[PDB]
Design a protein around this ligand. Structure first.
Ligand SMILES: Cn1c(=O)cc(CP(=O)(O)O)c2cc(F)c(C3CC3)cc21
Length: 269
């Protein structure tokens, strides 16, 4: 409900200092009050699709009772860069649940590609997002090609608003069965890669689950989170960045600052 104007000028100054574009959408699930800045624009997902990927696996698990316990074996050629958990279990395999936890909590790339294969590829994950009423999300490619973050390329993008809307449906709404919903929340709460992003803007006595993304080019990186402040309804928010030049660097500090401004706009402690 507006609230944006409490912080439209501060956001424009932050992105002028960063040297690129910042996109924010934050929802107070209590009042329905929102904060929006470039909330409709497309930004590259980078690794952030891995949280939605885990949610799609959990949705499939509601239909296929054995799915999460299924052992998956893989070869050395599956171990693309940034596979910190799957590289330790090459010789043993891992379960679908373990791959899902690795994809969410360590951004594990081999795990992400193996679970994409289970869902029928990038189109399969896109299909799941359409099934919960997200018409904006698109995944087009696999790891690592989906990280190209080419300016104006809609492949492998979504909008901050669509990301927040979908995250709310999956973590707090009715898109997942209750046990699956709590598993998704617990995976996000256990994320290890987000300490310098939205988490850096959240007090220690508030619960938070998040999923990061970092493309490594074009100043492109992001984070989305559900935050449970004490004594009020949860907040859902998405913070995405990009920049014009290929060797522009992302900034975790800019993502934490954007998160702070969003929470300040919502009037949150
Ligand atoms: C540079 N970088 C990070 O610095 C950090 C993560 C973890 P996340 O922030 O994406 O979750 C990272 C993940 C990746 F898949 C990639 C591939 C493009 C090469 C790069 C990453």
């Amino acid at each position: 409900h507006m609230l944006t104007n409490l912080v439209a000028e501060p956001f424009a100054k932050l992105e002028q200092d960063f040297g690129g574009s910042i996109g924010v959408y934050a929802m107070d699930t209590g009042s329905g009050a929102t904060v929006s800045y470039r909330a409709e624009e497309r930004f590259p997902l980078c690794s952030s699709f891995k949280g939605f990927l885990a949610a799609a696996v959990l949705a499939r698990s509601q239909q296929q009772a054995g799915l999460l316990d299924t052992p998956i074996r893989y070869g050395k050629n599956a171990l693309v860069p940034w596979s910190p958990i799957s590289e330790k279990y090459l010789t043993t395999g891992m379960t679908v649940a373990e791959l899902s936890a690795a994809a969410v909590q360590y951004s594990d790339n081999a795990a992400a590609n193996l679970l994409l294969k289970e869902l029928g590829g990038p189109a399969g994950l896109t299909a799941f997002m359409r099934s919960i009423g997200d018409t904006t999300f698109r995944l087009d490619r696999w790891e690592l090609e989906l990280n190209s973050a080419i300016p104006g390329d809609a492949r492998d993008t979504s909008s901050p608003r669509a990301v927040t809307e979908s995250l709310q449906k999956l973590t707090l709404g009715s898109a997942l069965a209750a046990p699956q919903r709590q598993q998704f929340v617990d995976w996000l709460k256990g994320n290890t890669t987000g300490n310098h992003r939205i988490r850096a803007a959240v007090p220690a006595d508030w619960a938070v689950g998040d999923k990061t993304g970092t493309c490594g080019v074009y100043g492109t990186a992001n984070d989305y989170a559900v935050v449970w402040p004490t004594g009020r309804a949860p907040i859902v928010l998405a913070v995405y960045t990009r920049a014009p030049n290929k060797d522009d660097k992302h900034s975790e500090a800019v993502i934490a600052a954007a998160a702070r401004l969003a929470l300040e706009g919502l009037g949150v402690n």
